[PDB]
Amino acid sequence: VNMLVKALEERADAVPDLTALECEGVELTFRAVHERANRLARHLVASGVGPDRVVAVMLPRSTDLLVTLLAVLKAGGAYLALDPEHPAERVAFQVRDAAPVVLVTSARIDADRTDLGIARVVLDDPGTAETLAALPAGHLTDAERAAPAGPEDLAYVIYTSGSTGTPKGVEIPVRALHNLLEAMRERLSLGPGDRMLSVTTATFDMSVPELFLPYYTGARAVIAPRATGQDPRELGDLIVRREIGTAQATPTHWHMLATVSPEALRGLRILIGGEALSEKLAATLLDLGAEVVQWYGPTETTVWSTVHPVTGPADAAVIGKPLRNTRLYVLDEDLVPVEQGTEGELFIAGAGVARGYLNRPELTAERFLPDRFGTGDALMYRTGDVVRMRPDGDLEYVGRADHQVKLHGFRVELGEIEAALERSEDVDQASATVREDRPGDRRLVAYVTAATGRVPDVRELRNFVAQTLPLYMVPTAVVALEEFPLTPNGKLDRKALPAPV
């Protein structure tokens, strides 16, 4: 009933001698990747892995990481990716919450980062390496598993970035990850020959396609080394040197790549998603020659749930059409569907919906409602995002249900202000926000970076805006910054923009 592993293995048997991973002039074949992963999967099964059991994984970005995650699935378990640079506490919360059976890790990480209270399977330990390399290396029969793997069995537990709040753990089933990858194979026409770039951190669920989609399709993950993760020059050079057709990043990161490595986007299939895509960015990407495909989706519904090819700068907030076996309801405050063109909160149903939050069963009930247009135990995720349907059936993101109460009797579209600001040649990026620095005095503030070799006069910026937008939308104060604050995932952090006087 685990079609995922059967498909993965069906693929490795049909291209045994192609390359499936490549990292720093090292390549592995499909047969090699799976033999290596099969051996671990047996050793895992001996370490207490079974269906719905969590295998903590703390490994640098490496072929060694991509092999392990594959092993965990083969073992019928579910993986929780830890971060070896994370403070002990971020990692200690996750271990206490998810009760991992075993930690797969490496002996080159400081032994105190891996001293977490779990059993350890350490790949580079002389001995574990001996036992591992000695195990039978064939694909596992279900006899060699702990128990048959169901479609409801967990694939992975990703943890959520709560607004300075208890991190929530999302439980993604196998049928949901299998469904996403199948849709992504179909939308991208991904197969042998094709190279995809694997760069995104494993604790960010946007990585999940970069980790399993090459396995699933017979493409080749070109793993960027850990150092190239933050150097956008080196990534541009890697993209060009190793002829990478497809890569996936947040818009913040795609911006950096254009600023520093314009040539790399020539003939490059960008997958962008995670924040809003400005019209300015969308034009830049297209000017440099990139094929742009936009993906939207909460982590509580796998990774992505909608896709839109961005043909031109108009489409920047068109998040497109639902992926396979996904259903998108845009409903009112009483859970009633709205008429085409009317705004409403986006509810997501179908195969990609998670099982719920991990042992936070109260907040589960508040965000995973019973699927109102489904049956039995089906569930629908309340995204918390407002959308409108255009006549063509495509959807457009409008904003977050919360950040929508009027400012001084008027609805403010904080994107319009940014697009206004981003038309001045002295500005690169703009972010707008409604501030409350003294309670009751809500005010519009906008933030700007500089275009290369220009200085934004932050008073004439208000002039420039005041002739394009309603006066109630002109920011009280504009503020120029050297760089924008970012989240660990490399998204703009609007909660950390400093207040003006």
Look at strands 102-105 and 54-58 and give their pairing: parallel
Q: Binding segment for ligand YG3 among 17-25, 188-196, 232-240, 270-278 (CB under 6 A)?
A: 270-278
Asked if 275 is part of the footprint of ligand YG3 (rule: CB under 6 A), the reply reads yes
Q: Give the nearest distance from C-beta 396 to ligand YG3 in angstroms.
A: 10
**Cβ of 219: how many Cβ atoms within 10 Å?**
25
User: At which residue do the structure tokens 């064939």 appear?
Assistant: 138
Tell me, residue by residue from 208 to 227, as one string, x for binding to ligand YG3 by CB under 6 A and - for no binding: --------------------
Q: Give the nearest distance from C-beta 418 to ligand YG3 in angstroms.
A: 13
Q: Binding segment for ligand YG3 among 25-33, 108-116, 142-150, 291-299 (CB under 6 A)?
A: 291-299
Asked if 299 is part of the footprint of ligand YG3 (rule: CB under 6 A), the reply reads yes
Among positions 51, 298, 350, 475, the unique one binding ligand YG3 when judged by CB under 6 A:
298
Residue type, 334: D
Give the bridge partners for 318, in sequence order: 396
User: At which residue do the structure tokens 């995204």 appear?
Assistant: 383
Kindly determine how many residues on this chain lie close enough to bind ligand YG3 according to the rule CB under 6 A: 15
| Contact by Cβ (8 Å): 344, 338 | yes
3-class secondary structure for 24-91? Answer: CCEEEEHHHHHHHHHHHHHHHHHCCCCCCCEEEEECCCCHHHHHHHHHHHHCCCEEEECCCCCCHHHH
Nearer to ligand YG3, 106 or 200 (CB): 200
Nearer to ligand YG3, 125 or 275 (CB): 275
Asked if 319 is part of the footprint of ligand YG3 (rule: CB under 6 A), the reply reads yes
Look at strands 26-29 and 19-23 and give their pairing: antiparallel
Residue 445 in 3-state DSSP?
Answer: strand
Q: Binding segment for ligand YG3 among 29-37, 215-223, 263-271, 290-298 (CB under 6 A)?
A: 290-298
- Distance in angstroms (rounded) separating the CA atoms of residues 174 and 180: 10
Among 226, 262, 218, 270, which residue's Cα sits nearest to residue 244?
270
Q: Binding segment for ligand YG3 among 272-280, 282-290, 351-359, 451-459 (CB under 6 A)?
A: 272-280
Q: Give the nearest distance from C-beta 161 to ligand YG3 in angstroms.
A: 5
- Distance in angstroms (rounded) separating the CA atoms of residues 20 and 29: 5
| Contact by Cβ (8 Å): 276, 253 | no
Q: Give the nearest distance from C-beta 249 to ligand YG3 in angstroms.
A: 12
Task: Determine which helix (DSSP H) or strand (DSSP E) holds 381, and give its type and residue range.
Answer: strand 379-389
Q: Binding segment for ligand YG3 among 50-58, 271-279, 327-335, 362-370 (CB under 6 A)?
A: 271-279
Nearer to ligand YG3, 53 or 382 (CB): 382
Among 44, 41, 202, which residue's Cα sits nearest to residue 119?
44
Angstrom CA distances, 245 to 240, 265, 330, stand at: 9, 10, 35
Distance of CA 214 to the CA centre of its chain: 16
Give the bridge partners for 296, in sequence order: 306
Tell me, residue by residue from 154 to 183, as one string, x for binding to ligand YG3 by CB under 6 A and - for no binding: ------xx----------------------
Q: Give the nearest distance from C-beta 170 to ligand YG3 in angstroms.
A: 7
Distance of CA 285 to the CA centre of its chain: 20
Residue 186 in 3-state DSSP?
Answer: helix
- The contacts of residue 194 (CB under 8 Å, 6+ apart) are 217, 219, 220, 245, 246
Q: Binding segment for ligand YG3 among 26-34, 138-146, 191-199, 269-277 (CB under 6 A)?
A: 269-277
Tell me, residue by residue from 381 to 420, as one string, x for binding to ligand YG3 by CB under 6 A and - for no binding: ----x-----------x--x--------------------
Asked if 274 is part of the footprint of ligand YG3 (rule: CB under 6 A), the reply reads yes
Q: Give the nearest distance from C-beta 250 to ligand YG3 in angstroms.
A: 9
Tell me, residue by residue from 103 to 142, as one string, x for binding to ligand YG3 by CB under 6 A and - for no binding: ----------------------------------------
Q: Which residues between 16 and 75 bind ligand YG3 (CB under 6 A)?
A: none
Among 492, 304, 313, which residue's Cα sits nearest to residue 419?
313
Q: Give the nearest distance from C-beta 433 to ligand YG3 in angstroms.
A: 14
- Distance in angstroms (rounded) separating the CA atoms of residues 381 and 298: 9
Nearer to ligand YG3, 30 or 295 (CB): 295
Residue 168: DSSP 8-state: P
Asked if 276 is part of the footprint of ligand YG3 (rule: CB under 6 A), the reply reads yes
Q: For the purposes of burial, counting CB atoms within 10 Å of the CB of 125, is it exposed (0-12), middle (13-18) or buried (19 or more)?
A: middle
Nearer to ligand YG3, 279 or 385 (CB): 385
List interacting residues with ligand YG3 (CB under 6 A): 160-161, 273-276, 294-296, 298-299, 319, 385, 397, 400
